[PDB]
Structures are given as C-alpha cells and as structure tokens.
Amino acid sequence: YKKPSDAELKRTLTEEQYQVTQNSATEYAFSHEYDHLFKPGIYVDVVSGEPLFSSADKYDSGCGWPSFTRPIDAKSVTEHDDFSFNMRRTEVRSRAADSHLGHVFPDGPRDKGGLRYCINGASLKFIPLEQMDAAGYGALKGEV
Numbered sequence: 711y712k713k714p715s716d717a718e719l720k721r722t723l724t725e726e727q728y729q730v731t732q733n734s735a736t737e738y739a740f741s742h743e744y745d746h747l748f749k750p751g752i753y754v755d756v757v758s759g760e761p762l763f764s765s766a767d768k769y770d771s772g773c774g775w776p777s778f779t780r781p782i783d784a785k786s787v788t789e790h791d792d793f794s795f796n797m798r799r800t801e802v803r804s805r806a807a808d809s810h811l812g813h814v815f816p817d818g819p820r821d822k823g824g825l826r827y828c829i830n831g832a833s834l835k836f837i838p839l840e841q842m843d844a845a846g847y848g849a850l851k852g853e854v
C-alpha cells in the first residue's frame with residue numbers, strides 16, 4: 711500500500727477526496743453516503759487501498775460522519791496532535807498513504823474501548839463482504 715505523487719493524485723481523486731485526504735479539509739456533516747451505511751464489509755484508504763476500518767466496529771454516534779470504535783488494525787492509522795482552529799483534538803491519518811482521515815475522541819462506547827473515530831467518508835472506499843475476495847482482501851473476512 712503506497713501513495714502516488716501529489717501530481718498523480720490531482721488527476722485521479724475528485725476535488726472533494728483530494729481536499730479532505732491531502733489538505734485535511736472536512737466534508738459537511740451528514741453529507742456522505744457512508745454516514746448511514748451499515749453493511750458487512752471493510753473501509754479502505756481511498757488513496758492506497760490500505761484496510762482501515764471494519765463494518766464490525768461501525769456504529770451510530772450521531773456526530774455527522776462515519777464512526778468506528780477502533781481501526782481494523784492498531785497499526786493501520788497514526789495519531790497526531792491537532793491545534794487547528796483554536797482547540798485541541800487528535801487527528802487520525804492512514805499509515806501507508808498518510809491520508810487525513812478525521813479525528814478520534816474519548817467518548818465512544820465504553821464496552822468497546824471508549825474511543826470514537828469520526829471519519830470523513832471522502833477518505834474511504836467501501837468493499838462489501840461479497841466482493842472482498844475478488845478485491846484481494848479475502849484474508850480480512852474474519853474481521854467483519
């Protein structure tokens with residue numbers, strides 16, 4: 711899982727996908743299809759295809775963006791202090807392509823770890839269970 715050149719990205723990603731993953735922009739709350747999508751499968755980095763979240767950990771937090779209790783693999787994402795626009799939050803970015811994904815907060819389901827990963831649907835690509843094998847993610851079916 712690798713990240714193409716900035717120049718190549720400009721010609722493959724939509725304006726929205728590019729602004730969110732490359733410039734850390736934020737999609738309008740409740741605007742993405744993935745917000746209310748709850749079907750079996752996984753969500754991968756729109757840029758590199760790296761698996762990031764599983765349908766197994768997706769839940770309704772009412773925050774406005776796809777929400778998960780944890781990443782599909784602890785190593786899949788990286789955390790960063792975000793002192794953007796007068797406040798302190800923890801930014802979440804993908805490991806391989808370093809795409810801006812969203813933020814994580816300490817107010818998630820307590821029995822699931824207590825974390826809430828709020829992610830832009832524009833930074834993801836959903837792979838339904840029925841297509842995971844063909845897509846090359848067969849080994850991850852155990853995570854749904």
Ligand SMILES: C[As](C)(=O)[O-]
Nearest residue numbers: 736775812813828
């Ligand atoms: C707008 As957000 C999904 O980075 O808390």
